[PDB]
Amino acid sequence: NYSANQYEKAYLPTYLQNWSPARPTKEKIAAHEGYTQIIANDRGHLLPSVPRSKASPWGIPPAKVTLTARTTTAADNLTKWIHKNPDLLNACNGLRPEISGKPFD
Amino acid sequence: RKVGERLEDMHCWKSELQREIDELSSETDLMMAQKLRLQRALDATSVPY
Amino acid sequence: MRECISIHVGQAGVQIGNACWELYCLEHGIQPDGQMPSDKTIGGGDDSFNTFFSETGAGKHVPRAVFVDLEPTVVDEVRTGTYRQLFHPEQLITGKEDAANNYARGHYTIGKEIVDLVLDRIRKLADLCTGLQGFLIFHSFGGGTGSGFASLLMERLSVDYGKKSKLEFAIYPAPQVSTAVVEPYNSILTTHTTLEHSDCAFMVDNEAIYDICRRNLDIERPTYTNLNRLIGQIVSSITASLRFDGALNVDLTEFQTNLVPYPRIHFPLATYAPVISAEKAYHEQLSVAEITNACFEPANQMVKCDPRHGKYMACCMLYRGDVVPKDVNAAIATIKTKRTIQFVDWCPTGFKVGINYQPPTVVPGGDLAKVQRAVCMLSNTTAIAEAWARLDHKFDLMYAKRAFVHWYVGEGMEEGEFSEAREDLAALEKDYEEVGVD
Amino acid sequence: MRECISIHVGQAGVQIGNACWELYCLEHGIQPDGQMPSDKTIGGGDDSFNTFFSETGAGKHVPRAVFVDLEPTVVDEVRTGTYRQLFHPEQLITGKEDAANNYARGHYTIGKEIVDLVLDRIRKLADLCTGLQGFLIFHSFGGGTGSGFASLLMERLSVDYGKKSKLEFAIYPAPQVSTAVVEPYNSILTTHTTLEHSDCAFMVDNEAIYDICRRNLDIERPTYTNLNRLIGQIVSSITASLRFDGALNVDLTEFQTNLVPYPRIHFPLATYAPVISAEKAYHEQLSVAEITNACFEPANQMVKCDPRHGKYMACCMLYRGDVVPKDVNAAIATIKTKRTIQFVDWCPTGFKVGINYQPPTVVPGGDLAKVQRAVCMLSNTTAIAEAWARLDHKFDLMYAKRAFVHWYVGEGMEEGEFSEAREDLAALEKDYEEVGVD
Amino acid sequence: KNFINTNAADVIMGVAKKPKPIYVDKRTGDKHDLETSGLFPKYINKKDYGI
Amino acid sequence: QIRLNREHKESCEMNWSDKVEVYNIDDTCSRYTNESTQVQFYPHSSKFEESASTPETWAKFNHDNLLRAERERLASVNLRKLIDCILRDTAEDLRLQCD
Amino acid sequence: NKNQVVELTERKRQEKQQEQEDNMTEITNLLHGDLLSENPRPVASSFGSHRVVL
Amino acid sequence: TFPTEADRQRALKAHKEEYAVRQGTLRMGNYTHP
Amino acid sequence: MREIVHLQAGQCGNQIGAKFWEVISDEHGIDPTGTYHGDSDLQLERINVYYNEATGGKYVPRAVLVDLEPGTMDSVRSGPFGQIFRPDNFVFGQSGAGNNWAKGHYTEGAELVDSVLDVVRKEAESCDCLQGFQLTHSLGGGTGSGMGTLLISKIREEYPDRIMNTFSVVPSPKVSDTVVEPYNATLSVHQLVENTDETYCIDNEALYDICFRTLKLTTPTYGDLNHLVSATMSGVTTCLRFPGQLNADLRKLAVNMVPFPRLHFFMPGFAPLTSRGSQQYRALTVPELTQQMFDAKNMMAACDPRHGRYLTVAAVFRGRMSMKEVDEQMLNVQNKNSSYFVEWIPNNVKTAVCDIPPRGLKMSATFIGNSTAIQELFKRISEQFTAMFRRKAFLHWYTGEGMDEMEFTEAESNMNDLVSEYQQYQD
Ligand SMILES: Nc1nc2c(ncn2[C@@H]2O[C@H](COP(=O)(O)OP(=O)(O)OP(=O)(O)O)[C@@H](O)[C@H]2O)c(=O)[nH]1
Ligand SMILES: Nc1nc2c(ncn2[C@@H]2O[C@H](COP(=O)(O)OP(=O)(O)OP(=O)(O)O)[C@@H](O)[C@H]2O)c(=O)[nH]1
């Protein structure tokens, strides 16, 4: 799930025809120390002491737009008319669009 | 260029005469069926006499 | 590479797309079977058809379009037509139940269960394609099945896929002819839903299509085939840049960037100048100047808008055929000098020239003339607000006496949504003069 | 060397093994009589059959499988079939009394006096074998005679032979179809007995087997011949790595080592990508890119599971036919980038690739396609727990009102074994959730 | 009766109703029940699993 | 009528066949290029220039044969309709008489 | 163009001839229309001659 | 569209005085003609 | 696919469907015996909207016949097409109605509703997904009104998601023969307006004049009148079965028709009506068709809406036409009488064109009308009811059956409420 080195032109949506970015990647790791203890028994069972992703994931008005120049009051709703929907802001391919614009005077 | 022109010209007539033979065969089958129907009617004719 | 996808929603959108694909197979010399002659053009699907067809090692030119429908009636005989062998069987989306002219019925009752399937068709088209610049959406504002079903799909394709273009094509409602009085209900519903998502919406009206033909094509008795012939020519002309090169090549990306001035309003108007009968073409001469006069003659537009009642912002001309830069630049210079033509003082230049060597072809058993120099006129003017102005007084009376709502509230809406569209429109009309004001 | 033994238990397991053996003779061209043509392949029993058939100096290919049954009907009728001369008479282990759909009746009443005879078959087969990597157990969870009898034999073969693999294959109970109401009873009984002994259990469901049959194979009226042809193809594909070579060859040990994450749970899912009708294959094309999406397309899995409702741990693809490293390594790289594919972060790598050059062949009088590029997709995900969760809320009701128990306790059981199995399942579910929690 | 004005009030307080989640399969594929399809439902949502 | 229709079928079929082979050979030969093989020196001749036909006359032949088949099919359809009507009238008359 | 126009006119003449013969055939059917002709023969849909259809 | 509210108020009065003469329903279209 | 199951009610209906069904069989080219003669490809595939398949290429009608008197059923069975109808579909009772509405609505209905519902659901499960149902019956018919009002009520809750098409004939205003008929009609319409969604209005007196106008044949048979209405109901159903750029669903039509829910009553309009010389004296042109389509004499349903105004109008055109003429004809009539419509709705015209001509003529059409002309109909029956209820003539029968005057009170009141509905909208 990492980005490779140097030859970073052979793996892009250029061939994927991907229209929702795949996954953010990086090339950097802090120098890890640690005897990397084992904290389960036989089943992925975390020993009660150690923490996990504590059941975080377990398992339309949103659209791309720039505010540009459309009446402030209409634009203000649009921002709210974009957000306040975590059913489309959290997970499951990403569900998350972008935004831009500029204010008025 | 001249050879290509002649080739497409030939291809046209090929196509329509293809299709023409096709409908001729279909119509021949249709008259087969109707001839057989007349034969059956003639077969049925006899008894009332 | 350079390709795009066509979609045909509404039972009206299927016969027109049929003619378009019927037109498209001619210039490539496609036989109805699905294969070329013994001549060598087949492969992995890479030739003039690669942008349009998918002729893989199987040798069958597979068109890159999906025809979606909700009634088995009109979608079956085409599946028994002449090129049904060409068409991918499960690309021809059929249904068993109609939307009954109801946007919401198609948009809610039946839309959920079928969009997932067509989304599967979209993705399995998406994976096989390479560059896929945009989509070709063929619909209709008074969509009996077009209205509701197009909206939901263009929502779903927008939200998952937002980084490309989406090209929209619908018949505009006839200003004084209405084959349905619930047509204003969904039409404004479609418009307000599409303003914030649609990239490029292009309209057309059948009345003036008829009005043209008995004017100069001289046929007092055309047919839908004739109607579909003209519009199919329009989309053929705009895609000739993809099909053929020229002095310069232009793309839909340029069309989007250069045509729309500002957000919301993205509704230019098409036009095709050399509309004339074969006999009138026979003993007359065509040159750039007169067709440049003809293209801007007010009676040659398919949309009932007096251009003098409005003002121009953009004008795109796409010369397909044997032309030279000299006369056209001189001719357009004279056009700039004209006084009756009134672009906004805001735009110094609003002209996007397209040059294509290829003379447009006639269709066998057709009705058009034989043209050497053609031009397509996609343009946007302020004379269009009257149409929506026509719609609102039509709609404002109707909603006050709220006819037919018993059906709409009867299957699961309320009046708030109908409220939104009116101030949505009231925004569009009020914006139209504000930008119309210099 | 590289050979194994197959076992066919339950009256369901008897036709399926036959069709597999029927299939197996085709790719080797074996005649029904038992001998090859004048061409030379016989010997001391050493050729492509040496792993499957025993064609000794007698010249007759003897399949290395045992058909065990408790009712003479189906076992005798196949003994009068077409290949009965090939088969070993008392390898066709018949019975005169049924298990009466009762696990323990099959497990206790009659299995005692028959297993020893079957054990003699095992050892007399074991001694002649050389490599004897493992076994191919064909059974069913709702085994009318499979459930009880497969359990007892598995126990005895586990205790005497614990150094080799045991490969299990059972029709998973139909989630919404229950041809028996004791079918849950014995199914949970089978599960709890097998969790601590079975090596690799692979399931499949008939309802989805039909679902493709009319979806892409387009048969509204197929029969078990088609169904056994499908599964016979599946086991043929997994044995192709044994039968032939490729870019790389993989053995059952590698799968076992690479499929099961952690002990107990050894239940992955099978899927075969190029499933299509012949005529649809006729004018279309197949390559790695599209078949990759289809095999991971959620509706192509023969198990009623949504991968989006779960998360991936293991996935195995075995490519049988003409493929190249370049596209496949790129194509899988596409899948890793895919967002819908939600593997557990525990495994950055969760794929096992098997390349086999051999194009899969058609069977005469068959219904399959003409496959050059094939892949069977073996995978394991967290979305499987619903099936067992479906069984327990089924099972808990009946057990609370203790239906049909008067039979089971009547012929020799009590509630303790029933009591034990439920918390084992309750253990499995929380285990399935604890692995699902990261 | 100003039944004209009633019809306004009839649809003004008409609220709305609901559809039913059902799916389709094929060319002429029928209206296959999505709801509890047994294929892609929300099955694991009850306080009885595992515990 | 059957006999006549089958004869016309055969004639148009043989001409179609001939255009098929000539088209195939033309396409196969057209693939030639200057550097490739299938490149041979011969002496010239007069059958190289032998004269037998002209394109407009050939098209005349084709169109005339087309017309022949067209008219024969028309006649067949007419005869079929006449037969059906005759059958109808016969049945009705017999019915009334027996009643 | 002229040749196309010339054959265009011929199609016009032929479809005139086509649409004409449709009319006379349509006229013929109306002449033989049973509803128009009101023949007293088809009223005897009964099996026995002594009994009629009411 | 206007940069300054002063130009906004300058524009609206310029069209308000020119309202009736101008064509178009919103009275922004051009009277023109000889 | 979507399909329709038909219901055959009333003793008049016993004739109605009989003529209606044989027209369909003759239109589609099936013999009286039932063995279809393959002649037109298009009619072959779209026959399953109405007919199921039987062995030997026999197309079983999916219609149910119901009555009380065996003799009529014996007659329709002994007809030229009685063989194509099923003995299964022949459900009936062994009693005489007295043609009493209450007896057919409360007494005789009770022991037959169970049986008849089984047959329809047997037929309903025989098919997959319907548009809805249509009923041939009469509002003035004694036994038909009793059965239908029961059946329509039961099927409502059974399938509240389908099309409850109704076809009823309005008795002659000048004379009703049955003197208790207005009692029968007013009772039936009370539930009918409650239950129905679509209803056709048909009058014999108009049909009698049409015989005097275009048939010109002096003495017809009642079946000849049925032949006309069967042609009309066939023409509207041609849109479903046949291809062409016109949308078929009655709901697609219905959503184009009904301004407000209480609008269920609709009037027909039909295609060239021609007399002896005029068959060879007519130049069949869309103008002269369209002229004839909106002729004050061409109407046949109730009366002249010249008295009233036109709410919604829909004409479907069957033949080789095109969008242009129907557009200009629509413009011509729109300019012909712009004021004769209502200002409440402009563009109240709904157009569809069927490209498949009928067997017998090329260019045809059908019209369905919603105007303000029905007021004359029920204002007539209004005083009829009041005058007879003024002195409760012929009432001891219904009280003996178990009926009371209070039922009449809301029935007329509901009727009166609908009368105010028509005007206060229009006026
Ligand atoms: N572009 C185009 N429009 C048409 C054509 N024929 C009719 N139209 C108009 O386009 C509209 C199409 O909308 P609908 O009538 O709802 O068609 P639909 O949604 O596909 O399905 P239906 O409701 O069954 O008709 C119609 O109202 C016509 O006015 C055509 O051939 N091409
Ligand atoms: N794999 C397979 N399954 C089948 C076949 N025919 C039926 N089945 C199903 O598989 C199940 C077989 O389990 P059982 O009924 O217990 O069969 P059994 O254990 O061999 O013995 P019995 O109790 O006699 O039937 C049946 O319930 C059927 O639903 C078949 O031909 N092949």
Ligand SMILES: Nc1nc2c(ncn2[C@@H]2O[C@H](COP(=O)(O)OP(=O)(O)OP(=O)(O)O)[C@@H](O)[C@H]2O)c(=O)[nH]1
């Ligand atoms: N069959 C038939 N019915 C007719 C005819 N003319 C008028 N009708 C009327 O159509 C109505 C409907 O028939 P049904 O509902 O079956 O009649 P009913 O319930 O038995 O009661 P009645 O009206 O007394 O016959 C009858 O009431 C007749 O008044 C005709 O010529 N033939």
